[PDB]
Design an enzyme around this catalytic site. Structure first.
Site, mmCIF file in Angstrom:
data_model
loop_
_atom_site.group_PDB
_atom_site.id
_atom_site.type_symbol
_atom_site.label_atom_id
_atom_site.label_comp_id
_atom_site.label_asym_id
_atom_site.label_seq_id
_atom_site.Cartn_x
_atom_site.Cartn_y
_atom_site.Cartn_z
ATOM 1 C CG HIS A 1 -2.040 0.936 1.082
ATOM 2 N ND1 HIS A 1 -1.970 2.312 1.509
ATOM 3 C CD2 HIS A 1 -3.280 0.789 0.759
ATOM 4 C CE1 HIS A 1 -3.322 2.877 1.308
ATOM 5 N NE2 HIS A 1 -4.177 1.682 0.738
ATOM 6 C CG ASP B 1 -8.639 -4.448 -2.883
ATOM 7 O OD1 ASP B 1 -9.743 -4.520 -2.727
ATOM 8 O OD2 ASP B 1 -8.097 -3.478 -3.610
#
Ligand SMILES: CC(C)(COP(=O)(O)OP(=O)(O)OC[C@H]1O[C@@H](n2cnc3c(N)ncnc32)[C@H](O)[C@@H]1OP(=O)(O)O)[C@@H](O)C(=O)NCCC(=O)NCCS
Ligand SMILES: CC(C)(COP(=O)(O)OP(=O)(O)OC[C@H]1O[C@@H](n2cnc3c(N)ncnc32)[C@H](O)[C@@H]1OP(=O)(O)O)[C@@H](O)C(=O)NCCC(=O)NCCS
Lengths: 371, 370
Positions: free
Chosen positions: B257, B307
């Site tokens: 991320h 996700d």
């Protein structure tokens, strides 16, 4: 805080250089002036994508790939015929391009440089066919297939009018496409690159460009500028209109630029064509307003931009005002394609930050205890 | 020069705050943990848009406006029936939203805060109707109109399944939407704000968001992550696969991320639901892989993101994998709308620069001389 991301360089580029203070523009090292005078849209697109001017055979072969890509599948025309007749051109193009993606075998494939140029040939070649025929279809006119032998610019005027254009029109149109072809990382190109940075598909990326270009303070100003002169009415009412606009803090359309702090080099060339092809009165109104902008707003860094004179040129070529921003798109697709391919060649997701201001750690309170 | 715009603060916001180092997330000051536990998507949307938790009356009226906007005009369904059946859901949603814009009398209107929320209610309410029924239509099933009495989350499952979902499913789906609702200026939200910054219309802005979210290294990873678990095949092949991947410089989907350098707070919550509703084996596989990441990639700031586990949760509620990214879109539309409205309230076109490294002043050479 970099508001508007002003002066923030997001990557290195070999496509286009802009000199905002001097008002100079280069496509792969060649001045826009030189290209507007000696090149063609097709050659400029070739230059933008592959980095150098094509050889005789390279250009002929590229022109051939494009020409055979201008046609629209029957299902595409059917969707166009199903759009609300009152749909504005940019919005219509948006949907049609999205549908083109749905029927393309590579419509969902993650972008890669090679593939971007391949799809680019098809979409670049097709936009004029969609734009001209959307005007015809929405007006109950017969669809006019492209003419492989005409240049990209001539063929657009041909499909739109149903008759091949005169030399001076093919020239003005071709020059217009060259001038709108590329401009570094403007808002629409940034949107295209941002979508591309997630490795999404070509169509999704170009659609973001279309959406951004549509904006009235971006490409949409090409339509707002000409409507603005028409709103003024006569050269005699310009001055009064100008000071009222300043007082009202109203934006003078076709003026101002994030990069150029002086006359836009593309605007100089467009003014020349507007002078010889534009409506005398409108040109008069535009020139009068232009002098006031230069007189009072120049020190501020607000001068004339590319969207100020182009409308008058298109209007003089019997092109409806509602198609001007789509013409910008017809040209800019070249630059969008070039940048999408360049950015993803050494991709990095574009993901900045925002500075939060407010309380954090607020405790949830059941709705019944809320006032 | 900032390739990736890493740590470039463009503007101020009061919509969402992220603590990348501590792995914390707040929507208008409230932790996502609390909202996922005690709130609902509709309530979270109200909070996101208007900045405060609604009153009994405010929430009820809002839920009413949303429910009344879930239906699709006959002309839209017709367009859906005209799309190629092999069109991927996100691509189909993109075209349909574009069309909805075309038929909307405000589809070309320059965005303004008030107008953005107005149109936002309409598009936000219609996404699940489009998504669910695209799946049905493309497979020969009858169109199932929305049920007003159902919550946004339950209605989606009802339309997709042709059956109202059990309480536990409505909850998991509702939580999923809340967890996907907002995340500051990620790639898709930046795309939305960029289009909005030219004062273009709402539909054009949202479509930029959809196109970006679609990317496999952005929202699309939710589908890539679950397929990756299935690819591995069994908890015993994980270590092997994991290293062949690291050596092949292949990215581990669901991990990493730009902001979070620790476990994603949303991923924590999703794992819990994945534990309860997810497939045993798949979960086992995902768990072993999660450990290898926390082991080898942890130090590099590479952790588990939102996700990674959601797919398993959707899979457990009998939702086709092909619809996972569109579900992300179903929730994120709230954040897109919120940022669109907030940014244009003090608009400034977003237009940066590029560092040109070539030469200028090149002289045009006649084609014959080339
Ligand atoms: C091209 C454009 C979007 C660039 O925006 P930008 O780089 O963020 O420029 P800013 O809005 O920060 O301009 C700085 C100042 O000049 C003014 N300005 C810029 N464009 C102006 C225009 N076209 N007419 C009047 N004033 C203008 C601004 O209002 C601002 O004034 P301030 O110092 O009192 O706050 C902008 O100039 C514009 O809206 N132009 C009109 C539409 C157009 O033709 N563009 C397409
Ligand atoms: C979320 C994501 C897009 C963030 O990108 P970013 O902030 O620009 O990350 P960077 O590419 O700068 O990361 C730095 C390094 O970490 C590695 N890294 C990041 N995520 C990784 C992953 N998921 N698997 C393996 N390595 C990873 C990169 O390959 C890069 O290696 P390098 O130093 O040899 O060049 C990225 O982590 C990713 O692609 N994740 C996989 C897809 C996913 O689930 N996310 C959606």
């Amino acid at each position: 805080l970099a508001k508007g991301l002003e002066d923030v360089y997001i990557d290195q580029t070999n496509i286009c250089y802009i000199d905002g203070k001097e008002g100079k523009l280069y496509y792969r090292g060649y001045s826009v002036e030189e290209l507007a005078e000696l090149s063609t849209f097709e050659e400029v697109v070739y230059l933008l994508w592959w980095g150098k001017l094509p050889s005789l055979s390279e250009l002929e072969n590229f022109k051939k790939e494009l020409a055979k890509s201008r046609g629209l599948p029957k299902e595409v025309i059917e969707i166009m015929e199903a759009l609300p007749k009152n749909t504005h051109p940019m919005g219509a193009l948006r949907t049609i391009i999205s549908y083109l993606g749905n029927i393309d075998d590579s419509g969902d494939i993650p972008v890669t440089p090679e593939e971007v140029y391949r799809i680019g040939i098809s979409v670049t070649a097709k936009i004029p066919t969609i734009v001209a025929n959307w005007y015809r279809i929405k007006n109950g006119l017969e669809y006019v297939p492209p003419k492989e032998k005409l240049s990209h610019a001539a063929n657009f005027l041909y499909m739109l009018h149903g008759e091949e254009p005169p030399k001076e029109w093919e020239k003005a149109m071709d020059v217009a496409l060259i001038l709108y072809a590329e401009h570094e990382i403007n808002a629409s190109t940034l949107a295209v690159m941002t979508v591309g940075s997630t490795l999404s598909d070509y169509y999704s990326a170009i659609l973001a460009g279309i959406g951004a270009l549509k904006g009235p303070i971006h490409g949409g100003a090409v339509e707002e500028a000409i409507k603005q002169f028409m709103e003024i009415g006569s050269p005699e009412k310009v001055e009064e209109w100008f000071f009222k606009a300043l007082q009202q803090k109203r934006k003078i359309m076709g003026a101002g630029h994030r990069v150029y702090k002086t006359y836009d080099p593309r605007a100089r060339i467009f003014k020349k064509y507007a002078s010889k092809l534009g409506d005398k009165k409108l040109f008069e109104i535009a020139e009068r307003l232009e002098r006031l902008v230069e007189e009072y707003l120049s020190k501020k860094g607000i001068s004339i931009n590319v969207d100020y004179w182009s409308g008058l040129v298109f209007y003089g070529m019997k092109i409806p005002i509602e198609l001007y921003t789509t013409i910008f798109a017809m040209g800019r697709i070249a630059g969008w394609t070039a940048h999408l391919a360049e950015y993803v060649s050494h991709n990095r997701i574009i993901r900045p930050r925002l500075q939060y201001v407010g309380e954090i750690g607020k405790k949830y309170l059941p709705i019944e205890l809320r006032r």
